[PDB]
Design a protein around this nucleic acid. Structure first.
Lengths: 1313, 453
DNA sequence: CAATCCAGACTGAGCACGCTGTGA
RNA sequence: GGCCGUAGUGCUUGCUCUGAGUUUUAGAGCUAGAAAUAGCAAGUUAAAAUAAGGCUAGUCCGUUAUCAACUUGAAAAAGUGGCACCGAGUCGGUGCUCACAGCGUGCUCAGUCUG
DNA sequence: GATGGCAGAGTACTA
DNA sequence: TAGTACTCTGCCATCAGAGCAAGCACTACGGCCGATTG
C-alpha cells in the first residue's frame, strides 16, 4: 500500500502513462512472465506509452455504399428497359440481349456470335460505318421519319437511360431556347409593352457576352445593371434579370407587395410561387415571367449545347457529332502538318502509347490536359497551326464525346431526345406507343432522399415504411411507399431528445408552446419602475396576462416604450397564423392546441408542398381552400431544445401545476425556468433526476462512440481508459490519489485552389490570370496569404509582388503572446510588421480606418472570414481591453475543451463510485486536467528539452511531467481546484503570469525559498535541491514500456486498380468465371493476419512430404473462408497434416525477440518492422536541441549567449552521437550499407557548422527508429529504406504477447514448435 | 557425570523431545478466512544448502511429513548471529494476519531478573534445545503450515507440513510458554526453597547453598526428562557461581555486564553516517542501566539521529562520544533487587535532563540497583527550576515502577519539592496522584546527593 | 448596502520509522 | 458564472444522384516480303463489371467502430500475475519470518483553554 | 502520404 | 548445368462533383441576470 498518482498524455495515435509516488519517483516492480520459456520474471518501470494506428471516419465507407447502391439501381433500370422490349426483341432477334450480356467474354467463352448487335460481321461493319458514334445513331433516330431497326432503337434508349445526366434543375427545359440576344430583346419588348410610362432601352448592349460571361452570376448581374439605363439593382427589370440568370430576387419592392414572395426559377416550387404572385398583383405580368423563364433556359443551355437547334430536335447529339467532325478534321490537318514539317516525330506522336500524344491520348491513359501539354510546343514550333493553337487555348481541340466536362448536361436533354425518338418510332411499334409514359418514368425516376433505401427489415440504414407489401417498381412508388411517414421518420430519426427528459422528443423551435414559454420567461425578467414605487417590483400573473394579450398577441416585437404607453399609460408563430387563418378566437382558443401543434409539426417536418397538403387534408374541413393553400405555402425551419412533456406535461406533486402554469402565475417571485428546475422544494428537480436515472449508462465503448469529436481522439480516449484500469489492477487494486491528464490540440490544396478561384471570381480581379499558381505551390503559407490578399498589402495601401515573396512580414492580428493561433484566419501578410502600430495590441485605429473598405471588400469576396474581420476591426470597437488581456492569459493555462471535460467526467465516474449518507459522492480520486503549455514551459525553463525524432520515450516523459506538474500545482494552490480539478483585471493578470514561478529559484530579483511550502498548512510541495534531480533521473531511465497495439487489418480487399491480362499468379479474378490470365484482375491483397502453420508439403516429382514451418497471409477476402474451416483452407493451399493446436494467429505488429535484444515487428506475412527504441543520453538530447535551435531562439540575450558557448564547448558530442547511432544499428538495425553511407556522409560533411551538422544528425535517427523503415537525408546524401522482406528468421524467435501497458507478457519460444 | 545420571533429559543422548502432557493443539482461524497459496520465494544457492541438512534430519524425526494442502508459505533461512547454522524459518507472514490473536503471557526481560533475590547465590542455567518442536500439532491444523521443497536426490517433491509448532509463527512463543509453565508448575510446589526463572525456553534455578542447587538440579533434570523436554548439555552452566543469563553476568548476586558487550560498544570507530551513529546508539542504550546520567550524556547525539539532517561531527558531538566510551569502561555492578526490603531512589535534574539512581540497603551502605535517566518533555522543559524537579521525579518514578514490581519506594532529592506538589505556585493533577499515593511512594528526609550517584 | 463565491499551547489514544537487546 | 438573441466557421452521421477512369470483347487493317520486318491506313464509339460475394431474396447487405495471451463460457462477459531497498544501456542484484523489551523522533484523530 | 505489394534483374544452392 | 529459391531496387497506389437532413464545437457581439452574509 502506497499513495500514488497517474499521469496521462493523450494523442491521436499515442497514449503515454506514468505512475509516480509522493516524492515524484516512478516505482519499479518485478512482473511474472507466462509461457514455455525459461524466463519467469522481469523487472520493469511503471512508465511507458501505447502506440496505435489512427482511427478513421465512415466517410469512405458511406461513399462506397452509395456507389454500390447506384450501380445496383442502374442495372435495375437496364433490366426494366429490357423487360419492356423483351417480347418484340424475341420476335426480331431472340439472342440480342444474351449477346449483350456476354460482351465481356473471350471468343472461346461466348456461346453466341462475337458481334453483339447483328451477329454477323458484314452487318456489324456496315452499322459501325454508318454510325461511327452512338450520337450519330441518336440524332438519326430523332430526326428521321422512316422505320428504324428495333435493336438500334433499344441501343439509343438504353444509352440515354444508362447515362441520364444531373438532376440539379427542376421543372422542365426547352432546348429550342438557344439564342440569348433574341430572347433578351423579346423580354425588353415585353417590358416596354407593359411598362409604357417608363420604358427600358437596351440597344447597343452586348447581352450575349454580358449574360454568358464566365464571371460570377452576381458580377454578371452587376455588369448588366451598369450597362443598362433606366433601372438598377432591386428594380423590377433588375430582379427579372437576376431571376433569369439564376439569383433569387425579392419582388416585394417592385409592386409594393409588403410580402417577400421570393421566386427561384430552378426550384420546383416556382410554379406555385408564380401563381401566388400573380394572384397578388395581376395577370398582365405572366408574359414577362414567361419571357424571363425562356431567357433563363437559353442562358443555361447555350453554355453547353453550343449548336444550332433550329434544324434538329437533338441539339446534344448534334453537338457531339460536330465535335466528332472537328476532331476528324483537326486530326487530318495535324497529320498532314507533322508529315510536312516534322516527319521524325510522327512515330512518337501517332504510334507510341507510352509517351503522350495522339497514341497515348486514345490508346494510352493520357488525359486531355496531358495531351494538350505534350502537343502545345510541337504546334508552336510549326507554321499553319494558328487555328489549332487557338482551339488548344480555348480547350476545344481533338475532343472525345465522353469527357469529364459532360457533368453539366441536364437529364432533361436526354429526356427530350428519348421522347422525340419514341414519338418518331411509335407509329411503327404499337408497344413503343403504349409504354411511352413508363419509359419516360424509367429515365426520370429517382428515389427521394427522405425515403431512403427500399429495404424490407434487413438494413440498419433504412427507415422507409411500405403501405403495401409488394415489389417497388418506379411505376408504383407512390402507391407502395408511404412517403409522408417515410419523411417524418427520416427527420425524427436524427433530431435530438430532451436532456431533462431523455426519452422525450423535442418540440419544433417555432412551436406555439415554445413561443409562449420563451415570451413568458422574457416577460418575467423585466422589472418595471414607475412613480410611487418604494422598491422595484415584479409583474404579477394577471399583469403578465394583460401585457401578453395587449402587446405580444397584437404586434410582433414588443418594446419598452410600447409597454409603457399601451399598458402602463393607457390602462395603468401566433402572428404568422393570424394573417393566414384570419381567425382570432380560434388561435386564442385552448381546446385546439393539439391541432395547432400538429400543424406546426407538419410545417417543420415536411419541405414539399405536396406532402404538406396531403398531411393537412385532415384539417381541411376546419379551414377554407385559400386558408389551406396559405398553410401549405408557409413552412418553418428549426427544432427546439425543450420537450412538450417538460414544458406542460409534468406537474408539481404539491400544487398540481406545470412549469408553464408556474411561469404564468409567477407573481411577485418571478422565478424563471432555471429557478423552477433548481428549486429544492419543487418536485420538478426530483422528476428530472428520476427521468435521467432511467436507462442509466451504456457500455464504455458505446458511450465513447456516442461522444462528439474525432474518431482518432475517441480511440485514444478508449485506450486511455483501458490503460488506467490496467494500471489500477497492477498497483494492487488501489485507486490513485490524482489522475493528471492532458490532450493534444490535434485534398487541402484543392480546397485552397477552389476557394481562391471563387474569391477571385467574386472580386472581379485577374490575379490568377496574371500568373497561374498550382495547388502544390499554393500550399505555401506566404503564397496563400499573398493570393488571398489580392496581391496587395493588408496593413497599408500598397501593392505586393509575387516575385518579391519570402521577404514580406507575416503578422498575427491578435498578438501571439495573448493567443497562440497560427491559422490563416489569424495570420496576415504585410510588407512590414511595424505598420500595424503597437506590437502588444490589435492593429492601430489609423490603419483600421485606412483599410476598412478593403477588408469589407475581402469579406464580401469570401477571401476573409467574419472572425478575421472582427479581429481586424477591433480597434474601432475599443481594442484589446485589460479584461480581454487577462482572460486571454488565463485561458492559456486552464483547459476548457468539451472533449477534455468528457474524458474527465468518464474517468471520474469510473474512479469515484461510493456515496455518503446524504448521497454526496466521495471524491476519492481527483481528476486534474492541464494544457500542454504548462509542461512545455516547465521543460523549456528547467532544461528538460524534448526532441521527438530520437525515440518514442517522449510520450512517457510528457505523461510523467504532467503528473508531477499537476500534483505540485494542486498541492501548492488548493484554491485552484475549481479551474483544474474536475468536480480585478490587474490582479488576475499577474496571478496567472506567475502561477508557475514557485518552481524556479529566482524570479524576474526575488530570492524565492529553496523549499516550497504549502502555506497555511505544513505540506512541502517542492524541494528544488532534490526534486529536480529526481526528474532528471526519471528522464534518463533506459527502460520505458513502449507497446505498439497489434491489430487485425480490415477494409478493402486489395488495390482497386484493374490490371490488364498477364500470366501471373498474383492476379485476382474480378468474377468467379473470369480467368485473370485472360481478363485481368486485382492485385496486392491486404493481409488480415498471418497464421503460423507447421505442416508437410509435396516437394519434387515423388511428392515427398517435407516438414515445413512458415507464415501464411490470410487476406481480407478469404478471412471468413479460413475461419469457417482452417483445416480445409490449409489443405486446399497445399499443406498436408497440419496441426490445429500449432496454428497460431499473428496479427500486425506482432513482436519477436531474436538475439542481443533485437526485436522485429510483423508488418505482414512477408515483411518485418523494427521494434527497438534507442535510449539516447539526456545530455546528448539537450545538446542536439540547443545546437539545432528548436523553434529558433526564444531566450533572453544574456541566456542566449551562454547556450551558444555551451554548444561551442560541447562540439565533440557529435562524434559520440554518431558512435551511439552506429553501435545501435550494428546491434539491432543490421543495415550495413545504410550505416556505411551514413558514416561516409558524416565524414564528408564534418567541416560544416555545428547548427547544420546537428540539424542533419536529427534526421539520422530515422535509421534507428521503431516502425516501418523510411528514407531520410543527411545534407545532399539521401538514404533509401532497408526493408526486412523475409519472415523466416522469426520462426525460431520468441513471440511476446504484451498487454496494453507491456507489464504483463507471455513469451512463447517458437523454436520448440 | 551429569549426562550419565539422566539419559532422558539431555538432548545429546535423549534424542528428540515430545511433550507427553500437553495435548495436540488446534490452531484456530478467523471466521472470514480463506486458504492462501504463495509460491516459494527465490533463495540463494548458499542459503539453500544451509537448510538442506535440517530438512533431511527433520524428515527422519517425523516433524516434517509430506502432504497436499491449499496453504503454502515460502520457506526462508535465518542464519544465527554466530557462524552459519542457517536455522529454518517458515516465513508465515500471510498466515499470521489470518490466524486468530491470543493475549501474550511471555515474560519481559526487565522483570525476570527482578525476581532473583541476592540470598540465592548458587545458580544453574539450563537451555532447552529445539524448544518449539516439543509441542505436538493436531493433524487438522497441520495443512495450515506448508512449504514447497523439491530435491531430486530425495525423490519427493511437494508440500511438507509440520507436525509440531513451527518457527516464525506468531503464536509459537506464547503457546510454548504456557505449555512449559503448566508442566513445571508442579515442580515449583515440591521445592519451595528453589527459585525457578523461565524465559521461553531458558530456565534458571537459584538455590541457597551448594547442596541445595545439586539436589534441585537433579530433580529438575528428572522432571524435564519425564515431560519430554531435552536440554542442551554443551551449554549448560550447572552449580557455578559465575553464570550468564539473559545477556547478564551473575556473580556475588550482582548483575554485572559481560566484558564482550563492552568491547563491542567501544570497538566501533567514530561514526560518520546517521546509520553508523544509529548502530552505536543501540548498543549504548542496552547498557543505559549501568551508565549514570546516560540521557544527558548522549543528549547531543540524539538530534543527529534524524533521517533529515546533516551529519556534522562537531567538537561537542565528539565530547558526547568520549563520555560514553569512558563511562562504559568503569561501569559499576548493579545489584539484584530484593523485593522483600524497601527501595530507595535518588532524583536530580539539571538543564531539562532528569538523572538518578535506584539503590537498596546493603549492610551499612547503599548498593545501586539501576541507573535511571530520561529527557524531560518540552512542556516541562520551559518550567522554572523549582517546578522542573517535580516533573523529573514523576518521570523517573514511572521508570522505577517497571523494575521495583510496584513495591513502595522512597524518593530522595536535594530540594524539598515534595511539599511543593501539595501547594504548587490537567497534567499537574495527574502528577499529584502519582506522587501522593502513600501505598506506592513516599518522601523521606530531604537531603542532597553526590553528583556521581 | 457592499463584497465575495482560523492561530497558540497542552493532553490522551492509536500508528509508524530507525536502531539495539533476549530468545526462537 | 449562467440565461439568451444574432451571425459566421469547422467538423460528424445518414440519404438521393452525376461525370469520368480502369478491364475484356465488338468496330474485317492494306501492300511487299517464306519469315521476322518495313512502308501506309486508322484512331473519337458501344456492351458488361466496378470490391470476390451473401441469404434474409430486398430496386437489401458487403471497406466505420471493436480486437495481447490463458481459464470458464453458447455468447454477452467474468477471472489470471508478492513487497521493499540499492543501483542502471532497454532492466539487474540483494533481502523478506517471529514474540517480548529499551531508546529517539514524527504523524493522524479527538478533547481542553485563550485570542 | 507513408508503406506494403509486385515485377524484374542479380546471385546462389542443389538434383 | 538447369531448376527453384532468396535478395535488392524502383514504381505504384480510382478520382472529381451536386443537393438534402439532423447534430456538435468554437468564435464573436450585445442585454440582462446572482445570492448570501457581515
Amino acid at each position: 500500500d502506497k499513495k500514488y498518482s497517474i499521469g496521462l498524455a493523450i494523442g491521436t495515435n499515442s497514449v503515454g502513462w506514468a505512475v509516480i509516488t509522493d516524492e515524484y519517483k516512478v516505482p519499479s516492480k518485478k512482473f511474472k512472465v507466462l509461457g514455455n520459456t525459461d524466463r519467469h520474471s522481469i523487472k520493469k518501470n511503471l512508465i511507458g506509452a501505447l502506440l496505435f494506428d489512427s482511427g478513421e471516419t465512415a466517410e469512405a465507407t458511406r461513399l462506397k455504399r452509395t456507389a454500390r447502391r447506384r450501380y445496383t439501381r442502374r442495372k435495375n433500370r437496364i433490366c426494366y428497359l429490357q423487360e419492356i422490349f423483351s417480347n418484340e426483341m424475341a420476335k426480331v432477334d431472340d439472342s440480342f440481349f444474351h449477346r449483350l450480356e456476354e460482351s465481356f467474354l473471350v471468343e472461346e467463352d461466348k456461346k453466341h456470335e462475337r458481334h453483339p448487335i447483328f451477329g454477323n460481321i458484314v452487318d456489324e461493319v456496315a452499322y459501325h460505318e454508318k454510325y461511327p458514334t452512338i450520337y450519330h445513331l441518336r440524332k438519326k433516330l430523332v430526326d428521321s421519319t422512316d422505320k428504324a431497326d428495333l435493336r438500334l432503337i433499344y441501343l439509343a434508349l438504353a444509352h440515354m437511360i444508362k447515362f441520364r445526366g444531373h438532376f440539379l434543375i427542376e421543372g422542365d427545359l426547352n432546348p429550342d431556347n438557344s439564342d440569348v440576344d433574341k430572347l433578351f430583346i423579346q423580354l425588353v419588348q415585353t417590358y416596354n409593352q407593359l411598362f409604357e410610362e417608363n420604358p427600358i432601352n437596351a440597344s447597343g448592349v452586348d447581352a450575349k457576352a454580358i449574360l454568358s460571361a464566365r464571371l460570377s452570376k452576381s458580377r454578371r448581374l452587376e455588369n448588366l445593371i451598369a450597362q443598362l439605363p433606366g433601372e438598377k439593382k432591386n428594380g423590377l427589370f433588375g430582379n427579372l434579370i437576376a431571376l433569369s440568370l439564376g439569383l433569387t430576387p425579392n419582388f416585394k419592392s417592385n409592386f409594393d407587395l409588403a410580402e417577400d414572395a421570393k421566386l427561384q426559377l430552378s426550384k420546383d416550387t416556382y410554379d406555385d410561387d408564380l401563381d401566388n404572385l400573380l394572384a397578388q398583383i395581376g395577370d398582365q405580368y405572366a408574359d414577362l415571367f414567361l419571357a424571363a423563364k425562356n431567357l433563363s433556359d437559353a442562358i443555361l443551355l447555350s453554355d453547353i449545347l453550343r449548336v444550332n437547334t433550329e434544324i434538329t430536335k437533338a441539339p446534344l447529339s448534334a453537338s457531339m457529332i460536330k465535335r466528332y467532325d472537328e476532331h476528324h478534321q483537326d486530326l487530318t490537318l495535324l497529320k498532314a502538318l507533322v508529315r510536312q514539317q516534322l516527319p521524325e516525330k510522327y512515330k512518337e506522336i501517332f504510334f507510341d502509347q507510352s509517351k503522350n500524344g495522339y497514341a497515348g491520348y486514345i490508346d494510352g491513359g493520357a488525359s486531355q490536359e496531358e495531351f494538350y501539354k505534350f502537343i502545345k510546343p510541337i504546334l508552336e514550333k510549326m507554321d499553319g497551326t494558328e487555328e489549332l493553337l487557338v482551339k488548344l487555348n480555348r480547350e476545344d481541340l481533338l475532343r472525345k464525346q465522353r469527357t469529364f466536362d459532360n457533368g453539366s448536361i441536364p437529364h432533361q436533354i436526354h429526356l427530350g431526345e428519348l421522347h422525340a425518338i419514341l414519338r418518331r418510332q411509335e407509329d411503327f411499334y404499337p408497344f413503343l406507343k403504349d409504354n411511352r409514359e413508363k419509359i419516360e418514368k424509367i429515365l426520370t425516376f429517382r428515389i427521394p432522399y427522405y425515403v431512403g433505401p427500399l429495404a424490407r427489415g434487413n438494413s440498419r440504414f433504412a427507415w422507409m415504411t411500405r403501405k403495401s407489401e409488394e415489389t417497388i417498381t418506379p411505376w408504383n412508388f407512390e402507391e407502395v411507399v408511404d412517403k409522408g411517414a417515410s419523411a417524418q421518420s427520416f427527420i425524427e430519426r436524427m433530431t435530438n431528445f430532451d436532456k431533462n427528459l431523455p426519452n422525450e422528443k423535442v418540440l419544433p423551435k417555432h412551436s406555439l408552446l415554445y413561443e409562449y414559454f420563451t415570451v413568458y420567461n422574457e416577460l418575467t425578467k423585466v422589472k418595471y419602475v414607475t412613480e410611487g414605487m418604494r422598491k422595484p417590483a415584479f409583474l404579477s400573473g394577471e399583469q403578465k396576462k394583460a401585457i401578453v394579450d395587449l402587446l405580444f398577441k397584437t404586434n410582433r416585437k414588443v418594446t419598452v416604450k410600447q409597454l409603457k404607453e399601451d399598458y402602463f399609460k393607457k390602462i395603468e408563430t401566433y402572428h404568422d397564423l393570424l394573417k393566414i387563418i384570419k381567425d382570432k378566437d380560434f388561435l386564442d382558443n385552448e381546446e385546439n392546441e393539439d391541432i395547432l401543434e400538429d400543424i406546426v409539426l407538419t410545417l417543420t417536418l415536411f419541405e414539399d408542398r405536396e406532402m404538406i397538403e396531403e398531411r393537412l387534408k385532415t384539417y381541411a374541413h376546419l379551414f377554407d381552400d385559400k386558408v389551406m393553400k396559405q398553410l401549405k405555402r408557409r413552412r418553418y425551419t428549426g427544432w427546439g431544445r425543450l420537450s412538450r412533456k417538460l414544458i406542460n406535461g409534468i406537474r408539481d406533486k404539491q400544487s398540481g401545476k406545470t412549469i408553464l402554469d408556474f411561469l404564468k402565475s409567477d407573481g411577485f417571485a418571478n422565478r424563471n425556468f432555471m429557478q423552477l428546475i433548481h428549486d429544492d422544494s419543487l418536485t420538478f428537480k426530483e422528476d428530472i433526476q428520476k427521468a435521467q436515472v432511467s436507462g442509466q449508462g451504456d457500455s464504455l465503448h458505446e458511450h465513447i462512440a456516442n461522444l462528439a469529436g474525432s474518431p482518432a481522439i475517441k480511440k485514444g480516449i478508449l485506450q486511455t481508459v483501458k490503460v488506467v484500469d490496467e494500471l489500477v489492477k497492477v498497483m494492487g487494486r488501489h485507486k490513485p490519489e490524482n489522475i493528471v491528464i492532458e490532450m493534444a490540440r490535434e485534398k487541402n490544396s484543392r480546397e485552397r485552389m477552389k476557394r481562391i478561384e471563387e474569391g477571385i471570381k467574386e472580386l472581379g480581379s485577374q490575379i490568377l490570370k496574371e500568373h497561374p499558381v498550382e495547388n502544390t505551390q499554393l500550399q505555401n503559407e506566404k503564397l496563400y496569404l499573398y493570393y488571398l490578399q489580392n496581391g496587395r498589402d493588408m496593413y497599408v495601401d500598397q501593392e505586393l509582388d509575387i516575385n518579391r515573396l519570402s521577404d514580406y512580414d507575416v503578422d498575427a492580428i491578435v498578438p501571439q503572446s495573448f493567443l497562440k493561433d497560427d491559422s490563416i484566419d489569424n495570420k496576415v501578410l504585410t510588407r512590414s510588421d511595424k505598420n500595424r502600430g503597437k506590437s502588444d495590441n490589435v492593429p492601430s485605429e489609423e490603419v483600421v480606418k485606412k483599410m476598412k473598405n478593403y477588408w469589407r471588400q475581402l469579406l464580401n469576396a469570401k477571401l476573409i472570414t467574419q472572425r478575421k474581420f472582427d479581429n481586424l476591426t477591433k480597434a474601432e470597437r475599443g481594442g484589446l481591453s485589460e479584461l480581454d488581456k487577462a482572460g486571454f492569459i488565463k485561458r492559456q493555462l486552464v483547459e476548457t475543451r468539451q472533449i477534455t471535460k468528457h474524458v474527465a467526467q468518464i474517468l471520474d465516474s469510473r474512479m469515484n463510485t461510493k456515496y455518503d449518507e446524504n448521497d454526496k459522492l466521495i471524491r476519492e480520486v481527483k481528476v486534474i486536467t492541464l494544457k500542454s503549455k504548462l509542461v512545455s514551459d516547465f521543460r523549456k525553463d528547467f532544461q528538460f528539452y524534448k526532441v521527438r525524432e530520437i525515440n518514442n520515450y517522449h510520450h512517457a516523459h510528457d505523461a510523467y511531467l504532467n503528473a508531477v506538474v499537476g500534483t505540485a500545482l494542486i498541492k501548492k494552490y488548493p484554491k485552484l481546484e475549481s479551474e483544474f480539478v474536475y468536480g480585478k483585471a490587474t490582479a488576475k493578470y499577474f496571478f496567472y503570469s506567475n502561477i508557475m514561478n514557485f518552481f524556479k529559484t529566482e524570479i524576474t530579483i526575488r530570492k524565492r525559498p529553496l523549499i516550497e511550502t504549502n502555506g497555511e498548512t505544513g505540506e512541502i510541495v517542492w524541494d528544488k535541491g532534490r526534486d529536480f534531480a529526481t526528474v532528471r533521473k526519471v528522464l534518463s531511465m533506459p527502460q520505458v514500456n513502449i507497446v505498439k497495439k497489434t491489430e487485425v487489418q480490415t477494409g478493402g480487399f486489395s488495390k482497386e486498380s484493374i490490371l490488364p491480362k498477364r500470366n501471373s499468379d498474383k492476379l485476382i479474378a474480378r468474377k468467379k468465371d473470369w480467368d485473370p490470365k485472360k481478363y485481368g484482375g486485382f492485385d496486392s491483397p491486404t493481409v488480415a493476419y498471418s497464421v503460423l502453420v507447421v505442416a508437410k508439403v509435396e516437394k519434387g516429382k515423388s511428392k515427398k512430404l517435407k516438414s515445413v514451418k512458415e507464415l501464411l497471409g490470410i487476406t481480407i477476402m478469404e478471412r471468413s473462408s479460413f475461419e469457417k474451416n482452417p483445416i480445409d483452407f490449409l489443405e486446399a493451399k497445399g499443406y498436408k497434416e497440419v496441426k490445429k493446436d500449432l496454428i497460431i494467429k499473428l496479427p500486425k505488429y506482432s513482436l519477436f525477440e531474436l538475439e542481443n535484444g533485437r526485436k522485429r515487428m510483423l508488418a505482414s506475412a512477408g515483411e518485418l518492422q523494427k521494434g527497438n527504441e534507442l535510449a539516447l543520453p539526456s545530455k546528448y538530447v539537450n545538446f542536439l536541441y540547443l545546437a539545432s535551435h528548436y523553434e529558433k531562439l526564444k531566450g533572453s540575450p544574456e541566456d542566449n549567449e551562454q547556450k551558444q558557448l555551451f554548444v561551442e564547448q560541447h562540439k565533440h558530442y557529435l562524434d559520440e552521437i554518431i558512435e551511439q547511432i552506429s553501435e545501435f544499428s550494428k546491434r539491432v538495425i543490421l543495415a550495413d550499407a545504410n550505416l556505411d553511407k551514413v558514416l561516409s556522409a558524416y565524414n564528408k560533411h564534418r567541416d560544416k557548422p555545428i547548427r547544420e551538422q546537428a540539424e542533419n544528425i536529427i534526421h539520422l535517427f530515422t535509421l534507428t527508429n521503431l516502425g516501418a523503415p523510411a528514407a531520410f537525408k543527411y545534407f545532399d546524401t539521401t538514404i533509401d529504406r532497408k526493408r526486412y522482406t523475409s519472415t523466416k528468421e522469426v520462426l525460431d524467435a520468441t513471440l511476446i504477447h504484451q498487454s496494453i501497458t507491456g507489464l504483463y507478457e507471455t513469451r512463447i519460444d517458437l523454436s520448440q514448435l | 557425570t551429569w549426562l550419565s545420571d539422566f539419559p532422558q533429559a539431555w538432548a545429546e543422548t535423549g534424542g528428540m523431545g515430545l511433550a507427553v502432557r500437553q495435548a495436540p493443539l488446534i490452531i484456530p482461524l478467523k471466521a472470514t478466512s480463506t486458504p492462501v497459496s504463495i509460491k516459494q520465494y527465490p533463495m540463494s544457492q548458499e542459503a539453500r544448502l544451509g537448510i538442506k541438512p535440517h530438512i533431511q534430519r527433520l524428515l527422519d524425526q517425523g516433524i516434517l511429513v509430506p502432504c497436499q494442502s491449499p496453504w503454502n508459505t515460502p520457506l526462508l533461512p535465518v542464519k544465527k548471529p554466530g557462524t552459519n547454522d542457517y536455522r529454518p524459518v517458515q516465513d508465515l507472514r500471510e498466515v499470521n494476519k489470518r490466524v486468530e490473536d491470543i493475549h501474550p503471557t511471555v515474560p519481559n526481560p526487565y522483570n525476570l531478573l527482578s525476581g532473583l533475590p541476592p540470598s540465592h547465590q548458587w545458580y544453574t542455567v539450563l537451555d532447552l534445545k529445539d524448544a518449539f518442536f516439543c509441542l505436538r500439532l493436531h493433524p487438522t491444523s497441520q495443512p495450515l503450515f506448508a512449504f514447497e521443497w523439491r530435491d531430486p536426490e530425495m525423490g519427493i517433491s511437494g508440500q511438507l507440513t509440520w507436525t509440531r509448532l513451527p518457527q516464525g509463527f506468531k503464536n509459537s512463543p506464547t503457546l510454548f510458554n504456557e505449555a512449559l509453565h503448566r508442566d513445571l508448575a508442579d515442580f515449583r510446589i515440591q521445592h519451595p526453597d528453589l527459585i525457578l526463572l523461565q524465559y521461553v525456553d531458558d530456565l534458571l534455578l537459584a538455590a541457597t547453598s551448594e547442596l541445595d542447587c545439586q539436589q534441585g538440579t537433579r530433580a529438575l533434570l528428572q522432571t524435564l526428562g519425564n515431560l519430554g523436554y531435552r536440554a542442551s548439555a554443551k551449554k549448560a552452566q550447572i552449580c557455578q557461581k559465575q553464570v550468564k543469563y539473559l545477556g547478564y553476568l551473575l556473580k556475588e548476586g550482582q548483575r554485572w555486564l559481560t566484558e564482550a558487550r563492552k568491547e563491542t560498544v567501544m570497538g566501533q570507530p567514530t561514526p560518520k553516517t546517521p546509520r553508523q551513529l544509529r548502530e552505536f546508539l543501540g548498543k549504548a542504550g542496552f547498557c543505559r542501566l549501568f551508565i549514570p546520567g546516560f540521557a544527558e550524556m548522549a543528549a547531543p547525539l540524539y538530534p543527529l539521529t534524524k533521517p533529515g539532517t546533516l551529519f556534522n561531527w562537531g567538537p561537542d558531538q565528539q565530547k558526547a562520544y568520549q563520555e560514553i566510551k569512558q563511562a562504559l569502561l568503569t561501569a559499576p555492578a548493579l545489584g539484584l533487587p530484593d523485593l522483600t526490603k524497601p527501595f530507595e531512589l535518588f532524583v536530580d535534574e539539571k538543564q531539562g535532563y532528569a538523572k538518578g539512581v535506584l539503590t537498596q540497603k546493603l549492610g551499612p551502605w547503599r548498593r545501586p540497583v539501576a541507573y535511571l535517566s530520561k529527557k524531560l518533555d518540552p512542556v516541562a522543559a520551559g518550567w522554572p527550576p523549582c517546578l522542573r524537579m517535580v516533573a523529573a521525579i514523576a518521570v523517573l518514578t514511572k521508570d522505577a515502577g517497571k523494575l521495583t514490581m510496584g513495591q513502595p519506594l522512597v524518593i530522595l532529592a536535594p530540594h524539598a519539592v515534595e511539599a511543593l506538589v501539595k501547594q504548587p505556585p490537567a497534567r499537574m493533577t495527574h502528577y499529584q496522584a502519582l506522587l501522593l499515593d502513600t501505598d506506592r511512594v513516599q518522601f523521606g528526609p530531604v537531603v542532597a546527593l553526590n553528583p556521581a550517584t
